[PDB]
Amino acid sequence: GAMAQNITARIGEPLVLKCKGAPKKPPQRLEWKLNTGRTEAWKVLSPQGGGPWDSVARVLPNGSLFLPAVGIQDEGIFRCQAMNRNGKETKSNYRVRVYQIPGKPEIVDSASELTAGVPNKVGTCVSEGSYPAGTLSWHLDGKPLVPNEKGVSVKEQTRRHPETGLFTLQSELMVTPARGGDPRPTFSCSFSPLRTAPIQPRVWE
Amino acid sequence: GAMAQNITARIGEPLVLKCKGAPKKPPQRLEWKLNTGRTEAWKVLSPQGGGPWDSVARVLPNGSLFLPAVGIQDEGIFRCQAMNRNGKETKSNYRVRVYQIPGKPEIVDSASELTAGVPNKVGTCVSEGSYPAGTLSWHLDGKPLVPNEKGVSVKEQTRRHPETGLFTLQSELMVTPARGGDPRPTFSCSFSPALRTAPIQPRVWE
Amino acid sequence: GAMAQNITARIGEPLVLKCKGAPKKPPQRLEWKLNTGRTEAWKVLSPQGGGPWDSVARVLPNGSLFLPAVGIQDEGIFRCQAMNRNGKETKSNYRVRVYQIPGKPEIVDSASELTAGVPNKVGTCVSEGSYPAGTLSWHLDGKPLVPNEKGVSVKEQTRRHPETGLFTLQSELMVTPARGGDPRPTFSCSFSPLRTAPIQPRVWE
Amino acid sequence: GAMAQNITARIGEPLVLKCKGAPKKPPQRLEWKLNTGRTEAWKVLSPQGGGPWDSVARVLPNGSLFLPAVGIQDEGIFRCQAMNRNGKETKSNYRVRVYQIPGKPEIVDSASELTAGVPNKVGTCVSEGSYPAGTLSWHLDGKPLVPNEKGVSVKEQTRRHPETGLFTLQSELMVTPARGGDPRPTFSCSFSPALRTAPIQPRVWE
Ligand SMILES: Cc1cccc2c(-c3ccccc3)c(C(=O)O)[nH]c12
Ligand SMILES: Cc1cccc2c(-c3ccccc3)c(C(=O)O)[nH]c12
Ligand SMILES: Cc1cccc2c(-c3ccccc3)c(C(=O)O)[nH]c12
Ligand SMILES: Cc1cccc2c(-c3ccccc3)c(C(=O)O)[nH]c12
Ligand SMILES: Oc1cccc(Oc2ccccc2)c1
Ligand SMILES: Oc1cccc(Oc2ccccc2)c1
Ligand SMILES: Oc1cccc(Oc2ccccc2)c1
Ligand SMILES: Oc1cccc(Oc2ccccc2)c1
Ligand SMILES: Oc1cccc(Oc2ccccc2)c1
Ligand SMILES: Oc1cccc(Oc2ccccc2)c1
Ligand SMILES: [Cl-]
Ligand SMILES: [Cl-]
Ligand SMILES: [Cl-]
Ligand SMILES: [Cl-]
């Protein structure tokens, strides 16, 4: 596309996009065009407004575009063209990316004992309400644990809320502990674009 | 994919999908899996149910899957696997395609007079509330008018309702009437995937 | 989107799109913009050309846009803006939809005998090389046969060529013939957006 | 979907996916199913193979699935079901995500002088050949520069190669230098999903 300002917009929150170069208040010669999950190619929005789009996005008195509560379908491109009192045309181009932060992840199941030298199910971590999905990461004593790296295995499931579209992640960690290591290791789970309480199992030689 | 029964489901209407080979009532060994606009790959649904999915699709006592009101996002694939009393497994595979019929199309503007031998704007037709979009067709004396036929030109605009996702179509017809033709032709507009407009009958000058 | 001319373009065939209002030959003040399966939002193409896009679409001397062989990814929107010798701006807007016609469908398996009053597998029809997929229809004595209509059952499979993206369809027809009907019915299969040879089984009362 | 091993596969490189629990060599009771950019829902692949798919993915003697050179359209889900000698079934489920690393980013234009207290165009950075697109980040004296921070503005353009589908990024940085700061700041550009540019060191006037 064209040169644009990247905007990250949280779902459920308002968004105001500036129409650069527009007169401070009406009358203004300006037009907004957007191409999002709600449109078939470009949709034109004018200061007059009207219709179904008045429930979604409206042009404010200062010419800015206002969305009262961003949704997944508002991802896309938003552009304004305005004329100033003289007659200079000014363009504003925005690439809008939407997101949602999940709740704190939690460990829903965990082993209290691990046996060194054999594979063990360490635990299951769940995260609810992210957009886009993201992924869950595991940590050992505060250091990242790399999946499928000869001893560490991670499997993950992604499910979508049928109405909101937000993602729930469920990740399972298996480890083969090395003999002669820490007997009370600390494991934790985090959401990769917060972190869980650490679980502290016992390891046997 | 696999061999499936094609199902067409109207938006807003209920849908019942049969789980072939399931026992008539509980207990039943059966499982539904669906992959639609609402899922990340396959979602498993069981007779027990529960959770957010109970507002969208639930397994009935006879093992069928029931959606109270189909939406655009229910397009996709729906499968059941069941075991009968004897113990034979039976699979059911459905490809669900969703649609909505628009209201009757309307002519929102039309010429009352056309001049033969020059291009004329005949009229504008609008259709609201289709899914998928479809297209608008023009007719002259009950015969189809083919766009871009050296004399017939058609332009069309498709807009999407920002909350329902249903389409509104707006089509403009221009024609160059041939000298020595019908002086009172009849034009009509139709929705193409009743649904035809009242005909307009302008006057043509030689 | 905006008011556009709908263009249907066959895959593998050239496409020429007119830039209305452009001067007949250079120099011309004109610009093409396209948004297709090949682009991230709008891509601008100029008469000078250059780069990777010269293998796909180029502006001709008369200002028209030329694609030597349309592919699936050329579906989308194509627009031109030009200035004439005076200075009138003219816009051209095209919505391009791509397709491919399959080969003649064929019956790959068929019953030679049907028993009235019970379900029978009548036959299997295959169509190769369509885009978009389309569907296969069955006919009895030249009349359409409606699927899942208490006596008629149709199942269909759609597969995609891994490299070309063209679709292969396979449809199976089952019928429960009505007692006291035609003893030598004629069935045929057709591609719905040609037709097969009719199969003519024998029916028993 | 279901519980799966996440696999990251570089475009143009081979990929081997293990069919867990399959016998080491034929005969094997196993089946692969994949749903990717190349398929309409699930495609079944067998050890026998054959057809157009033999140019893309084939089952090896040990039952693993092999793709000689991954492409963008191989993103998706790959599953195996096998039976061992005893007779136990084992399933393998993979979620395959494809990527490509761009070339080293470059500064294609830069200011040699900046004026404190006014907005200045610092430079333009370009990255070619990423998948998915990614983004370009700017740094000042090794610290991240946050866009739209009342004084820092960044605009970016993403273009797609019309035949390979790989992305080219172009990012422009503008800053309003604060009076009384470093007179020879160092700016650099980096690719964000080595891959950092040489730093530019303009002069700033008070
Ligand atoms: C490249 C670029 C950046 C910012 C705005 C625009 C507009 C536009 C937006 C609203 C109204 C009229 C024109 C256009 C166009 O459509 O030509 N291009 C733009
Ligand atoms: C090819 C085909 C047709 C109809 C149903 C299925 C199921 C299934 C559906 C629900 C529960 C368990 C299995 C599967 C599978 O997943 O193997 N394949 C199927
Ligand atoms: C609504 C409509 C119809 C046909 C062409 C255009 C262009 C355009 C195309 C190429 C170059 C410059 C402008 C624009 C725009 O971008 O404003 N809108 C258009
Ligand atoms: C949930 C899950 C994990 C891994 C493999 C499978 C298979 C499968 C794959 C290839 C062949 C036969 C079955 C199925 C199914 O289709 O039921 N479900 C699976
Ligand atoms: O929608 C509107 C409302 C008022 C004036 C207007 O005029 C412009 C058209 C295009 C670009 C800039 C200005 C457009
Ligand atoms: O975009 C919207 C959507 C709904 C209503 C609306 O009208 C307002 C007037 C004053 C304050 C806030 C909103 C504007
Ligand atoms: O035929 C099947 C296939 C898979 C599982 C199954 O067992 C279930 C019973 C109730 C609910 C969900 C699953 C029965
Ligand atoms: O790409 C080009 C090449 C030459 C002239 C030109 O000037 C225009 C810009 C936009 C619209 C119409 C004309 C654009
Ligand atoms: O769009 C293209 C693509 C490849 C080559 C090309 O150059 C030609 C010159 C003369 C005749 C035909 C083609 C134009
Ligand atoms: O474990 C399985 C699951 C499904 C089918 C199967 O039998 C096949 C043997 C060879 C090739 C394809 C299928 C074995
Ligand atoms: Cl899901
Ligand atoms: Cl729209
Ligand atoms: Cl397929
Ligand atoms: Cl592009």
Side-chain angles (χ1 to χ4, degrees), chain A residues 1-23 25-28 30-47 49-84 87 90-103 105-120 122-142 144-147 151-162 164-178 180-183 185-194 196-205, chain B residues 1-23 25-28 30-47 49-84 87 90-103 105-120 122-142 144-147 151-178 180-183 185-195 197-206, chain C residues 1-23 25-28 30-47 49-84 87 90-103 105-120 122-142 144-147 151-162 164-178 180-183 185-194 196-205, chain D residues 1-23 25-28 30-47 49-84 87 90-103 105-120 122-142 144-147 151-178 180-183 185-195 197-206:
Chain A
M3 196 64 67
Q5 184 180 340
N6 286 319
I7 297 287
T8 64
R10 190 168 177 186
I11 288 159
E13 300 290 296
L15 174 64
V16 177
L17 298 175
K18 293 170 56 185
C19 184
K20 299 187 161 107
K25 78 182 63 53
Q28 305 132 319
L30 75 83
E31 189 162 88
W32 278 89
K33 296 194 321 185
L34 73 174
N35 182 352
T36 68
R38 307 188 185 274
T39 65
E40 179 70 22
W42 301 88
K43 165 73 188 166
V44 173
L45 296 177
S46 74
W53 272 91
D54 276 2
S55 305
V56 177
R58 270 183 226 184
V59 181
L60 299 179
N62 75 345
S64 286
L65 190 72
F66 179 69
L67 285 76
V70 167
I72 289 171
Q73 316 95 303
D74 295 310
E75 175 111 20
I77 298 161
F78 291 73
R79 312 185 148 176
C80 200
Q81 172 166 73
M83 292 224 327
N84 62 17
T90 311
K91 285 175 163 176
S92 306
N93 192 28
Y94 301 98
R95 171 79 176 81
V96 172
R97 294 196 180 65
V98 305
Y99 70 99
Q100 185 57 279
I101 303 167
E106 49 197 279
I107 307 287
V108 291
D109 182 66
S110 63
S112 47
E113 284 92 11
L114 311 175
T115 304
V118 303
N120 295 263
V122 176
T124 306
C125 184
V126 173
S127 172
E128 304 177 87
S130 50
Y131 186 85
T135 189
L136 295 173
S137 287
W138 292 92
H139 309 263
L140 165 57
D141 294 333
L145 224 42
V146 185
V152 175
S153 148
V154 175
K155 291 171 175 324
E156 184 172 75
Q157 175 171 30
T158 300
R159 301 182 302 263
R160 175 180 173 304
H161 191 284
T164 65
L166 298 181
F167 291 96
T168 290
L169 305 173
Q170 177 171 327
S171 177
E172 292 174 7
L173 169 73
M174 281 184 4
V175 167
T176 299
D182 176 356
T186 297
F187 296 94
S188 67
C189 162
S190 62
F191 178 80
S192 319
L194 213 30
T196 71
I199 66 137
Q200 286 134 334
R202 306 188 284 197
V203 179
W204 270 256
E205 309 289 334
Chain B
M3 197 62 70
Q5 185 179 339
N6 287 320
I7 298 289
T8 60
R10 190 166 176 188
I11 290 159
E13 301 287 297
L15 174 65
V16 178
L17 298 176
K18 292 172 55 186
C19 184
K20 300 185 162 127
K25 66 182 80 42
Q28 302 133 320
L30 74 83
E31 187 164 86
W32 277 90
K33 297 194 323 185
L34 75 173
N35 183 351
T36 67
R38 309 188 183 275
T39 65
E40 180 69 23
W42 300 88
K43 166 74 189 171
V44 173
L45 297 178
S46 74
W53 273 91
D54 275 4
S55 310
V56 176
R58 270 183 229 188
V59 179
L60 298 179
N62 74 346
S64 287
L65 191 71
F66 179 69
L67 286 73
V70 166
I72 289 169
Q73 291 309 308
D74 295 311
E75 174 119 9
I77 298 160
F78 291 73
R79 318 184 142 173
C80 199
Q81 201 196 18
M83 293 205 25
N84 78 290
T90 296
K91 294 191 180 80
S92 302
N93 193 27
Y94 300 98
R95 172 80 176 80
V96 173
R97 296 198 180 66
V98 306
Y99 68 99
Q100 184 58 277
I101 306 296
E106 321 182 22
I107 301 291
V108 292
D109 186 56
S110 62
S112 45
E113 281 90 9
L114 313 176
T115 304
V118 72
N120 295 263
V122 176
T124 306
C125 183
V126 174
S127 173
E128 302 182 295
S130 55
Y131 187 85
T135 189
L136 294 172
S137 288
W138 293 91
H139 309 264
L140 167 58
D141 295 333
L145 220 34
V146 179
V152 174
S153 147
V154 174
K155 288 174 164 72
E156 185 171 73
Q157 175 170 27
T158 300
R159 300 183 302 263
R160 175 179 172 304
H161 191 282
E163 299 198 84
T164 65
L166 297 182
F167 291 97
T168 290
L169 305 173
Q170 179 172 326
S171 174
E172 290 172 5
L173 167 74
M174 284 185 58
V175 309
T176 297
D182 184 348
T186 55
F187 296 96
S188 67
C189 162
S190 81
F191 178 76
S192 309
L195 285 158
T197 69
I200 61 140
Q201 300 135 314
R203 304 189 283 204
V204 180
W205 270 250
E206 319 286 327
Chain C
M3 196 64 67
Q5 184 180 340
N6 286 319
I7 297 287
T8 64
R10 190 168 177 186
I11 288 159
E13 300 290 296
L15 174 64
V16 177
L17 298 175
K18 293 170 56 185
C19 184
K20 299 187 161 107
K25 78 182 63 53
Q28 305 132 319
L30 75 83
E31 189 162 88
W32 278 89
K33 296 194 321 185
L34 73 174
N35 182 352
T36 68
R38 307 188 185 274
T39 65
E40 179 70 22
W42 301 88
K43 165 73 188 166
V44 173
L45 296 177
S46 74
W53 272 91
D54 276 2
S55 305
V56 177
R58 270 183 226 184
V59 181
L60 299 179
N62 75 345
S64 286
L65 190 72
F66 179 69
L67 285 76
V70 167
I72 289 171
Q73 316 95 303
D74 295 310
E75 175 111 20
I77 298 161
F78 291 73
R79 312 185 148 176
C80 200
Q81 172 166 73
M83 292 224 327
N84 62 17
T90 311
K91 285 175 163 176
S92 306
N93 192 28
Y94 301 98
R95 171 79 176 81
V96 172
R97 294 196 180 65
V98 305
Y99 70 99
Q100 185 57 279
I101 303 167
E106 49 197 279
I107 307 287
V108 291
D109 182 66
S110 63
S112 47
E113 284 92 11
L114 311 175
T115 304
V118 303
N120 295 263
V122 176
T124 306
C125 184
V126 173
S127 172
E128 304 177 87
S130 50
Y131 186 85
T135 189
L136 295 173
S137 287
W138 292 92
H139 309 263
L140 165 57
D141 294 333
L145 224 42
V146 185
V152 175
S153 148
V154 175
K155 291 171 175 324
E156 184 172 75
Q157 175 171 30
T158 300
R159 301 182 302 263
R160 175 180 173 304
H161 191 284
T164 65
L166 298 181
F167 291 96
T168 290
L169 305 173
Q170 177 171 327
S171 177
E172 292 174 7
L173 169 73
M174 281 184 4
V175 167
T176 299
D182 176 356
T186 297
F187 296 94
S188 67
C189 162
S190 62
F191 178 80
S192 319
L194 213 30
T196 71
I199 66 137
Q200 286 134 334
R202 306 188 284 197
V203 179
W204 270 256
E205 309 289 334
Chain D
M3 197 62 70
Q5 185 179 339
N6 287 320
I7 298 289
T8 60
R10 190 166 176 188
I11 290 159
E13 301 287 297
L15 174 65
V16 178
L17 298 176
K18 292 172 55 186
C19 184
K20 300 185 162 127
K25 66 182 80 42
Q28 302 133 320
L30 74 83
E31 187 164 86
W32 277 90
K33 297 194 323 185
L34 75 173
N35 183 351
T36 67
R38 309 188 183 275
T39 65
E40 180 69 23
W42 300 88
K43 166 74 189 171
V44 173
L45 297 178
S46 74
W53 273 91
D54 275 4
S55 310
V56 176
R58 270 183 229 188
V59 179
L60 298 179
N62 74 346
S64 287
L65 191 71
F66 179 69
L67 286 73
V70 166
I72 289 169
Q73 291 309 308
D74 295 311
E75 174 119 9
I77 298 160
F78 291 73
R79 318 184 142 173
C80 199
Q81 201 196 18
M83 293 205 25
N84 78 290
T90 296
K91 294 191 180 80
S92 302
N93 193 27
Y94 300 98
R95 172 80 176 80
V96 173
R97 296 198 180 66
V98 306
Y99 68 99
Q100 184 58 277
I101 306 296
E106 321 182 22
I107 301 291
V108 292
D109 186 56
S110 62
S112 45
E113 281 90 9
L114 313 176
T115 304
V118 72
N120 295 263
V122 176
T124 306
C125 183
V126 174
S127 173
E128 302 182 295
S130 55
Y131 187 85
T135 189
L136 294 172
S137 288
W138 293 91
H139 309 264
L140 167 58
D141 295 333
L145 220 34
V146 179
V152 174
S153 147
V154 174
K155 288 174 164 72
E156 185 171 73
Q157 175 170 27
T158 300
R159 300 183 302 263
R160 175 179 172 304
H161 191 282
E163 299 198 84
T164 65
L166 297 182
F167 291 97
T168 290
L169 305 173
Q170 179 172 326
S171 174
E172 290 172 5
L173 167 74
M174 284 185 58
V175 309
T176 297
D182 184 348
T186 55
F187 296 96
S188 67
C189 162
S190 81
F191 178 76
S192 309
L195 285 158
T197 69
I200 61 140
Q201 300 135 314
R203 304 189 283 204
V204 180
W205 270 250
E206 319 286 327

